[PDB]
Structures are given as structure tokens and as C-alpha cells.
Design a protein around this ligand. Structure first.
Ligand SMILES: [K+]
Ligand SMILES: [K+]
Ligand SMILES: [K+]
Ligand SMILES: [Zn+2]
Ligand SMILES: [Zn+2]
Ligand SMILES: [Zn+2]
Length: 156
RNA sequence: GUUCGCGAAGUAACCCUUCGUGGACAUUUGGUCAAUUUGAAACAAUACAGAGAUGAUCAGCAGUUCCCCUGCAUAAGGAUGAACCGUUUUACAAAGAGAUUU
């Protein structure tokens, strides 16, 4: 979230009920962002994957509060969005059929992949398994490179 | 996951609720690249020596080169940037004379 300044309106009614959870997310992100001297490239990437996961989880929590549980008012939701507590573009994808579990927006940026495809993590696990067993090899896909997503198709 | 349709249970019957089941939506990331000795950076350090044309001290500007360095550079600078300094035999014939040989 963005720093509090004269531009910031007071947190709407109900913020204090959710604030402890948002503070735990903040603490986790505050530690993940640190420099940890990871020697290996693989571990280095996995440390950015933790940040992408935490960002997703915080937005997912707020999304569940507003759209699924109706536990917060629209004024609070709009404030959380304005204050960058939740990613509105990612929540916008979660509201669309077939994207209800999208890990991140980067995994659907077709323009940035070599083949113009989405990230492999969008493919339903059943289709990868069928292709692999037909081919006679195990499923080689484990975690995608942009974020450590292991599969985010709505069916999985 | 969502949603459209169907079976079913719950309810007096709808709404609603769950179990089952068909369709729709969403569909292949990344690497020319592994993490200290063995696939390659260099300066420096110790020693000696102390810059071409000079009897002596020097300004230089070039050229040739499968040597380049600094610089944005087609400028300029780098000892006149450096190297240059050695080694060198046959398109080999003609005319004539005096000695050698059968
Ligand atoms: K001298
Ligand atoms: K000179
Ligand atoms: K010069
Ligand atoms: Zn994903
Ligand atoms: Zn992703
Ligand atoms: Zn992905």
C-alpha cells in the first residue's frame, strides 16, 4: 500500500476488523522483499515467486471479502483499491469466466511469450497429464518462471 | 471454479439445498545462460635499464604491419605510440687465347 499523506482519506468503517490480516500480509511482504544473498539462480527466482504469491493472496483476501462474502462495504473496498491494498486489474480477471483463479496478469500476456501463447500454468492439469501419458513421459511442468504458479486453471 | 441443461434427495408444493451427470468458458511458460579452482580480463610487484635522425640536446609529420591502446570521434593523444635497422648468388650469355684429353 501507498504511504499515508494529506492525499489519503480516513479508512472507512470496517477497516479495523480486517487490518490485522492485512498487517500480516504486509509483514510477510516486508520480509520477502529483503536481500537474502541467494547464490543460485533458481533460488533467486523462487524468492520473487514468494512476493507474487503474497500479492495474489492479499488481493484474493480482499476480493473474497467484497465479492464473495459481502463482508465489507463498497466504500471500504474502493478505499482498499485506491490505497493499493488490492490489485484491481487482477481482481478484474478473477471476475471473468475461466480466470477465476488466475495467478497473475503476466501469465496471460500472450504478446510477451515466444510463441504468442499464454503461460503453461493456465493449461488444465488433466490436459498436460493426458498429453504426457500419450507421449510416454511424465509431466515435466512444475512451476512457471514468472511466478511459482503450479497451475491456475479454474478447474484446478 | 463459474455458468447453462438434465437425474435425484430434502419440502405439502415452489423458492432454496445437497449428491450425481452432460455442455460452455480458460489451453503449453522458460534457457545461446547451472552455483568457487580446470576454457581463460588486466594492472601491479622485484630487478635491471633510461627515448629516432647526434659530436650533443631535441620539435616533429608520415608510410608499411596478420601490434595496437586512450578517446564520442573521420579530432587529438599514446617515446616522431610501437615494430622497421637483419639476411642477401643463377632469365647468366657472347667473343677469344694459352694450357689439359682421344
Ligand atoms: K633519457
Ligand atoms: K620526438
Ligand atoms: K605524435
Ligand atoms: Zn498461473
Ligand atoms: Zn503467474
Ligand atoms: Zn504461469
Amino acid at each position: 500500500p501507498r504511504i499515508k499523506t494529506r492525499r489519503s482519506k480516513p479508512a472507512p468503517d470496517g477497516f479495523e476488523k480486517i487490518k490485522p490480516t492485512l498487517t500480516d500480509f504486509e509483514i510477510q511482504l516486508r520480509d520477502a522483499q529483503k536481500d537474502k544473498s541467494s547464490k543460485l539462480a533458481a533460488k533467486s527466482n523462487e524468492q520473487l515467486w514468494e512476493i507474487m504469491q503474497l500479492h495474489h493472496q492479499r488481493s484474493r483476501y480482499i476480493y473474497t471479502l467484497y465479492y464473495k462474502r459481502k463482508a465489507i462495504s463498497k466504500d471500504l473496498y474502493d478505499w482498499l483499491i485506491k490505497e493499493k491494498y488490492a490489485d484491481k486489474l487482477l481482481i478484474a480477471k478473477w471476475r471473468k469466466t475461466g480466470y477465476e483463479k488466475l495467478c497473475c496478469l503476466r501469465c496471460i500476456q500472450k504478446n510477451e511469450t515466444n510463441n504468442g501463447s499464454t503461460c503453461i500454468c493456465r493449461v488444465p492439469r488433466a490436459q498436460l497429464e493426458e498429453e504426457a501419458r500419450k507421449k510416454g513421459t511424465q509431466v515435466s511442468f512444475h512451476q512457471c518462471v514468472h511466478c511459482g504458479c503450479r497451475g491456475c486453471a479454474s478447474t484446478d
